[PDB]
C-alpha cells in the first residue's frame, strides 16, 4: 500500500524485542520500504489460502502473542536481504529487487515452512515438534535461499540436484545466522525445534550422522522417499561445506579450513555461474573447484581445501 515509512517495535517468537520497518496509512502495515521493492508480511489466519491479508496493526506496537511470528518473519527477511546485498552484491532473490512476501499463521499446527514459487510460508508448529517456524533465522534464510536458487541454478528438486538445492539452503541459512551473530552454530533449526528438548536440532552440518543423515557418499540414500532423499543426502554436502570452512579430519582425510567468508564466496559463485538444473554431486565438486580457482588461483590453499573436503565425503 501507499503510505509513510516508519518504525515500529515488537517481540519475536523467542520473546526478544526488536524494531521493524512498517508503513503508515490509517493502519500500520508490515511493509518495509527500505529494502528493494519492499518486504511484505501477511496474515494467513490459520487458513491455507495465500497470501492472506497484508498485516495491519492499529498502534505500531507488536507485543501480542499472535504478532510474534509476523515480527520475526518480517525482521529476518530483512536481515537475509541485507546479507545478500552487502556480502554478495545481490539485490533480492531475483537480482532485481523483487518484493519479498511472507505469510504466517498458515494452517493449524503446521510443522513446516516453504517457498511456493512466489512467496515464503510459515506454519505455527504444533508446539511439540516446532514452535512458529519464522522464529529461526536459519529457517527464514533457508527458505529465501530456495528462491535465490530458483532464479539462478534452478536445481531440480529431486535426487542429487535436489540434495544440492537443500544443502545450498542450509549453507546460506547458516551463513546468514553467523552474519546476524544470533547465537550462531552449524546446526539447523535449533531455535524452533522441540521446545521441550534443549541442545538438539533438525539437522547438523558439523555432524550429519548425529541425526542419522549420511556424511559420506558411500552412505547415500538411494530410495524414492523424500523426492529421492533431498533432505537426507544434503548431509553429504553440508559436511563438505563445514569442512571447507572449519577444517578437520573426516574418514582419514585431513582438510585445512579456510573460513566462512571464503566458503560463502566459493559457493555463491558456483551457484550463480556454474551449476545447472540437473547438476549432480560430481558436477558440484567441479563447480566449486572452478569457483575457488577463479577467485584464488589454481595453486591456492583454497582450491586445495575444496578438493580435500570433497575427497573426505567421497565425492569424486
Ligand atoms: Ca498493536
Ligand atoms: Ca543458533
Ligand atoms: Ca542454526
Ligand atoms: Ca529443541
Ligand atoms: Zn529446503
Establish whether 302 is an annotated binding residue: no
Tell me the β-bridge partners of 18. Answer: 10
3-state secondary structure of 146: helix
- What resolution does the deposited structure have, in angstroms? 1.6
Question: How were these coordinates obtained?
Answer: X-ray
Q: How far apart are CA 123 and CA 139, in angstroms?
A: 12
Residues with CB under 5 A from ligand 5 (ion): 169
Nearest in space to 316 (alpha carbons), one of 209, 214, 217, 233: 217
Proximal ligand: closest to the CA of 27: 1
Establish whether 187 is an annotated binding residue: yes
231 part of the active site: yes
Calculate the CA 103 to chain-centre distance: 16
Tell me the β-bridge partners of 248. Answer: 255
What domains sit in the chain, N to C, each tagged with a CATH number?
A: 6-154 (3.10.170.10), 155-315 (1.10.390.10)
Establish whether 190 is an annotated binding residue: yes
User: Distance from first CA to last CA of the chain, Å, rounded?
Assistant: 52
Q: How far apart are CA 102 and CA 152, in angstroms?
A: 21
Residues with CB under 5 A from ligand 4 (ion): 193-194, 197, 200
What is the Å distance from ligand 5's center to 146 Cα?
7
Residue with cell 551449476: 275
61-62 and 4-11 beta bridge pairing: parallel
What is the Å distance from ligand 5's center to 190 Cα?
15
What is the Å distance from ligand 2's center to 296 Cα?
30
What is the Å distance from ligand 4's center to 190 Cα?
6
Q: Active site residue: 105, 143, 160, 302, which one?
A: 143
Residues with CB under 5 A from ligand 2 (ion): 183, 185
302 part of the active site: no
Contacts of 59 (CB under 8 A, 6+ apart): 28
Q: What is the CA radius of gyration of the chain?
A: 19
In the chain, % helix, strand, coil (3-state, to 5) comes to 40, 20, 40
* Count of Cβ atoms closer than 10 Å to residue 218 Cβ: 10
Classify the C-alpha dihedral 141-147-148-153 as positive or negative.
positive
Q: How far apart are CA 155 and CA 164, in angstroms?
A: 8
Residue 263 has φ and ψ, to the nearest 5°, of -60, -50
DSSP state of 224: S
The alpha helices in the chain, defined as continuous H runs, are 68-88, 137-151, 159-180, 225-229, 234-246, 260-269, 281-296, 301-312
Establish whether 74 is an annotated binding residue: no
Amino acid at each position: 500500500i501507499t503510505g509513510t515509512s516508519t518504525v515500529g517495535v515488537g517481540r519475536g517468537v523467542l520473546g526478544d524485542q526488536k524494531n521493524i520497518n512498517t508503513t503508515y496509512s490509517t493502519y500500520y502495515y508490515l511493509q518495509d520500504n527500505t529494502r528493494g521493492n519492499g518486504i511484505f508480511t501477511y496474515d494467513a489466519k490459520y487458513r491455507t489460502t495465500l497470501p492472506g491479508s497484508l498485516w495491519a496493526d492499529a498502534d505500531n506496537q507488536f507485543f501480542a502473542s499472535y504478532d510474534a511470528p509476523a515480527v520475526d518473519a518480517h525482521y529476518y527477511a530483512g536481515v537475509t536481504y541485507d546479507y545478500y546485498k552487502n556480502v554478495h552484491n545481490r539485490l533480492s532473490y531475483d537480482g532485481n529487487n523483487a518484493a519479498i512476501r511472507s505469510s504466517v499463521h498458515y494452517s493449524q499446527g503446521y510443522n513446516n515452512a516453504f517457498w511456493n514459487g512466489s512467496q515464503m510460508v510459515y506454519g505455527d508448529g504444533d508446539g511439540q515438534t516446532f514452535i512458529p517456524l519464522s522464529g529461526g533465522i536459519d529457517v527464514v534464510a533457508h527458505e529465501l535461499t530456495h528462491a535465490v536458487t530458483d532464479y539462478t541454478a534452478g536445481l531440480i528438486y529431486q535426487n542429487e540436484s535436489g540434495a544440492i538445492n537443500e544443502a545450498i539452503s542450509d549453507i546460506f541459512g547458516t551463513l546468514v545466522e553467523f552474519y546476524a551473530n544470533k547465537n550462531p552454530d552449524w546446526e539447523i533449526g535449533e531455535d524452533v525445534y522441540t521446545p521441550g528438548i534443549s541442545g538438539d536440532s533438525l539437522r547438523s552440518m558439523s555432524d550429519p550422522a548425529k541425526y542419522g543423515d549420511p556424511d559420506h557418499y558411500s552412505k547415500r540414500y538411494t530410495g524414492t522417499q523424500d523426492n529421492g532423499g533431498v533432505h537426507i543426502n544434503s548431509g553429504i554436502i553440508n559436511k563438505a561445506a563445514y569442512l571447507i570452512s572449519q577444517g578437520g579430519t573426516h574418514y582419514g582425510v585431513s582438510v585445512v579450513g579456510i573460513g566462512r567468508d571464503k566458503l560463502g564466496k566459493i559457493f555463491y559463485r558456483a551457484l550463480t555461474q556454474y551449476l545447472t538444473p540437473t547438476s549432480n554431486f560430481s558436477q558440484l565438486r567441479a563447480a566449486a573447484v572452478q569457483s575457488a580457482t577463479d577467485l584464488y588461483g589454481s595453486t591456492s590453499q583454497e582450491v586445495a581445501s575444496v578438493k580435500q573436503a570433497f575427497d573426505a565425503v567421497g565425492v569424486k
